[PDB]
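User: Predict Thiol:disulfide interchange protein dsbD's structure from this.
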Amino acid sequence: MALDANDLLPPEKAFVPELAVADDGVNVRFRIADGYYMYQAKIVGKTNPADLLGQPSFSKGEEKEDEFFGRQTVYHHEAQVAFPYAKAVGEPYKLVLTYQGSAEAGVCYPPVDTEFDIFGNGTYHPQT
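Assistant:
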């Protein structure tokens, strides 16, 4: 609310995950602090009842080269992924998202995994 950027805040509030269920799939977007960045390759996000969903569709970010991973795509703030359905089903499914990155200042924190239960609602958030 005051900063919403830099490494002045913890890795908990530094990221604002948001779920959005659709009729043709599920979309998840997480706002990362300007002082943090997650590697597209390190980031994970899959939603389905039993591996039914097709494949993830990253929203694309910015490619950069470093020594903490090398030359790969990462996010400096915007990080959303599309999960297009691959099978017709009216039953509930499970979603697993994993975030992992470092602070633009020069900090390396551990990965954070979060599961979201989808059963009709649209918007979903972690009860942590």
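The first strand starts at residue 15 and ends at 21.
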